């Protein structure tokens, strides 16, 4: 069970609302990578919470794919959430930032952008 194309619709906060807020303000994707980072998450999410979304990147009957999936949950402060997530792929990773940017979870609009690799 992951979420679908139409309830991530229903989940995001409108371009509109996204300019006001102080979270969004100078937003940048970063360089595409197949791990993203998402930000502004709600202090009690787990990591179950996190795999029902962005679980839609992978094909869980692959092993290849289900190797690459990897999430992190940790402190942004003081109050927040960050995660790093690693998925199958480049395409994936842009489809995840394109769709998931602005998700609310928990009452929290989530920020999602490339990371940079886990390993250098």
Same mark, same amino acid.
Request: glycine share 6%; proline share 4%.
């Given at each position: 069970?992951?979420?679908?194309? #139409?309830? *991530?619709?229903? %989940? ?5 609302? +996204?300019?006001? *807020?102080?979270?969004? #303000?100078? $937003?940048?994707? %970063? ?5 993203? $980072?998402?930000?502004? *998450?709600?202090?009690?999410? /787990?990591?179950? !919470? *996190?795999?029902?979304?962005? %679980?839609? $990147?992978? !094909?869980?009957? @692959?092993?290849? /794919?289900?190797?690459?999936? !990897?999430?992190?949950? +940790?402190?942004?402060?003081? +109050?927040?959430? /960050? ?20 998700? &609310?979870?928990?009452?929290?609009? +989530? &920020? &999602?952008?490339?990371?940079? @690799?886990?390993?250098?």
């Amino acid at each position: 069970e992951c979420i679908s194309r #139409r309830e *991530l619709e229903k %989940g995001r906060i409108s371009r509109e609302e +996204m300019e006001t *807020l102080s979270v969004f #303000r100078s $937003y940048e994707p %970063g360089e595409p990578n197949c791990r993203i $980072y998402v930000k502004n *998450l709600a202090k009690h999410v /787990q990591e179950k !919470d *996190l795999k029902y979304i962005f %679980g839609r $990147y992978v !094909d869980f009957s @692959s092993e290849t /794919q289900r190797i690459m999936f !990897d999430i992190r949950l +940790m402190k942004e402060g003081r +109050m927040k959430g /960050q995660a790093f997530i690693g998925l199958p792929n480049e395409k994936a990773a842009a489809k995840a930032l394109k769709e998931a940017n602005g998700y &609310v979870l928990f009452g929290k609009p +989530m &920020v &999602v952008q490339f990371a940079r @690799s886990a390993r250098p």
